[PDB]
Amino acid sequence: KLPPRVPNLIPYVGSFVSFAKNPVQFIIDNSKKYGDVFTATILGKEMTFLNHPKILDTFFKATDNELSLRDVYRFMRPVFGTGVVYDADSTERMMEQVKFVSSGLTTARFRVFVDIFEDEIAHKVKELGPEGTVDVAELMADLIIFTASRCLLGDEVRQYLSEKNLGKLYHDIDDGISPLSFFYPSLPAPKRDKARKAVGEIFQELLDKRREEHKKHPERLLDESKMDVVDHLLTQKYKDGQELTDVHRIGILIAGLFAGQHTSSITSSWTLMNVISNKKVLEKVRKEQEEIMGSDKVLDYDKVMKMDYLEACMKEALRMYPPLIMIMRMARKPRECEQYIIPKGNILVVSPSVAGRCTDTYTNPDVFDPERLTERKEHEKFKYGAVPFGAGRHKCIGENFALLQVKSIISILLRYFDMEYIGKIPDPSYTSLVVGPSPPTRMRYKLRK
Ligand SMILES: CC[C@@H](C)n1ncn(-c2ccc(N3CCN(c4ccc(OC[C@H]5CO[C@](Cn6cncn6)(c6ccc(Cl)cc6Cl)O5)cc4)CC3)cc2)c1=O
Ligand code: HEM
Numbered sequence: 001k002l003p004p005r006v007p008n009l010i011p012y013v014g015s016f017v018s019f020a021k022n023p024v025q026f027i028i029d030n031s032k033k034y035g036d037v038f039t040a041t042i043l044g045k046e047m048t049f050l051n052h053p054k055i056l057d058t059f060f061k062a063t064d065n066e067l068s069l070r071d072v073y074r075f076m077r078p079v080f081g082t083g084v085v086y087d088a089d090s091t092e093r094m095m096e097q098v099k100f101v102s103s104g105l106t107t108a109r110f111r112v113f114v115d116i117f118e119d120e121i122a123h124k125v126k127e128l129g130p131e132g133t134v135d136v137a138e139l140m141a142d143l144i145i146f147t148a149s150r151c152l153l154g155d156e157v158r159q160y161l162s163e164k165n166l167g168k169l170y171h172d173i174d175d176g177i178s179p180l181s182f183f184y185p186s187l188p189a190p191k192r193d194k195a196r197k198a199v200g201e202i203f204q205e206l207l208d209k210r211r212e213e214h215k216k217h218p219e220r221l222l223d224e225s226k227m228d229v230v231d232h233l234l235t236q237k238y239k240d241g242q243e244l245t246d247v248h249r250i251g252i253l254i255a256g257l258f259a260g261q262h263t264s265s266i267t268s269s270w271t272l273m274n275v276i277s278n279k280k281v282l283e284k285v286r287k288e289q290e291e292i293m294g295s296d297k298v299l300d301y302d303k304v305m306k307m308d309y310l311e312a313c314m315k316e317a318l319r320m321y322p323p324l325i326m327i328m329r330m331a332r333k334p335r336e337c338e339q340y341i342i343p344k345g346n347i348l349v350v351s352p353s354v355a356g357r358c359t360d361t362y363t364n365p366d367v368f369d370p371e372r373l374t375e376r377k378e379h380e381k382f383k384y385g386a387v388p389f390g391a392g393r394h395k396c397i398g399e400n401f402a403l404l405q406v407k408s409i410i411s412i413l414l415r416y417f418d419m420e421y422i423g424k425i426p427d428p429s430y431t432s433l434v435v436g437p438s439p440p441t442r443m444r445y446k447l448r449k
Helices: 016-019 023-034 057-061 070-080 091-102 108-127 134-152 155-163 166-175 190-216 217-222 229-235 246-259 264-277 279-293 300-303 306-320 399-416
Strands: 037-042 045-050 131-135 327-331 335-337 339-344 349-350 417-421 441-448
Touching: 016 023, 016 037, 023 037, 023 045, 023 300, 037 229, 045 246, 057 349, 057 417, 070 190, 070 246, 070 327, 091 229, 091 246, 108 134, 108 300, 108 399, 131 134, 134 155, 134 166, 134 229, 134 246, 134 264, 155 166, 166 190, 166 246, 190 217, 190 229, 190 246, 217 229, 246 264, 246 339, 264 279, 264 306, 264 399, 264 417, 264 441, 279 306, 279 399, 300 399, 306 399, 399 417
Parallel strands: 045 349
Antiparallel strands: 037 045, 131 441, 327 349, 335 339, 417 441
16 A cells, blocks of 8 residues: 655645755654655655665666656756756657767767866966965865866856856856755746846857857867867757757756756865865875876876776765755656555655665765775665666766766865865755755865975
8 A cells, every 4th residue: 555654744734844954864764763665745745755775676767657857857947948858848858958968078078178177276276375275165166167167068158257257147046946946846036037047148149159160160060079068059959850949058058067066066075075084085095196197297087087096985975975865756657666556646755865874785874984885895785775876767977077077176186285174074954956065164275386
């Protein structure tokens, strides 16, 4: 029959109160009370939490007409645009749009991306000076505003960042998104909407400029190392032959930059903080860096590919502090799952955060210990033991890029600076859509040369 329910405090509002304090602890606590599968009413939504790695196969392998992403992420529509990604007309169109982004994240482009990271950090160290303190979360976000923009949109975007305040507009859009929007998509957000329109106009100009550049240098279209997401969007069609609209192109770019920015800056923050706060971990990270760099003075893709330990540090941060704490679908048909049938209309929930603390999987899960991965391989105990990037048909297409951007940034910063964190590593703050550390996050830095 139906899964057990978390008793409602009120009707309607149901369990929103305990949930919103800490959605992660909410799931953990109620797992203990009611088991692997339970349902809670939250601001009117029937939400069925799947809480053990063992049972996640049917979630991640279901087709979109059984478990819909579009029904649950559609709320993003005012940020991304009408008709884009989870507001696409069909599952099929969404997948095609996702592929246009993934198509600018090729190995050829990755080699160029490393140079971009070097370039932006070099600009940034001018601001920072020989020593000081800086907010880690801001520093990463500020770096990734410039790096992700150039990576995805091309270098032509940088003059907008430097001269037309594009970075501020991103913030206006992105602080205009409340996690509550998940429940009340219609929440007015007029500042967000003004900024989104401004970025829209700028990205329209970027497209128009690229068009005529594709006139004066069609060779660009033949060079895989110079082809970015703007170029792919300007030269592709859907499979059935239908052309893209510039409105669609703008929305896809914005969606891509969104995805491309937060989850990464938050991960780089938690990673750097944990690395510089643990002497043994920092020693190993630096030993690895010194061996890989050899006599070489800057980064390249091949070097980054060898940074196995640093990559484990990032994965360990993702186990502990995955920035998307909930993965969701709406059931369009009833769904079995253990003894239970989950009713049509329920929202199924999987939590990367819960998974990362599960004890069937990880020993002392509150400790940041990259060696649980490299040596004890604890993640491999279950097929879905670690799902920071999701899994199955909708698994994150930006992974390897994430890994690249975060590893590069951390590696370059280490090369530049000795760094120590000020205070305890914070707790996560559940106030935002993408979850990051509670401010403030400060660190002391000093130049190494
Ligand atoms: C705020 C105070 C108090 C009232 N409160 N306290 C806590 N909460 C709360 C928190 C969180 C949540 N939620 C609901 C929203 N949520 C969430 C919803 C959708 C979602 O979508 C994942 C999809 C959609 O966007 C992306 C994100 N992404 C992928 N890679 C990097 N980011 C995505 C995929 C593709 C593209 Cl192109 C763009 C985007 Cl953004 O994947 C992620 C999280 C987290 C839990 C609800 C309430 C509160 O309301
Ligand atoms: C550490 C950084 C990142 C984390 C933790 C992360 C996490 C995720 C997760 C969990 C999903 C699955 C969502 C779901 O199935 O409901 C996902 C999907 C996706 N991610 Fe990421 N992501 C990261 C970086 C990126 C980057 C950098 C991009 C683009 C540049 C990106 C683009 C996407 C896209 C397009 C999807 C949708 C796949 C689909 O629906 O088919 N992500 N991501």
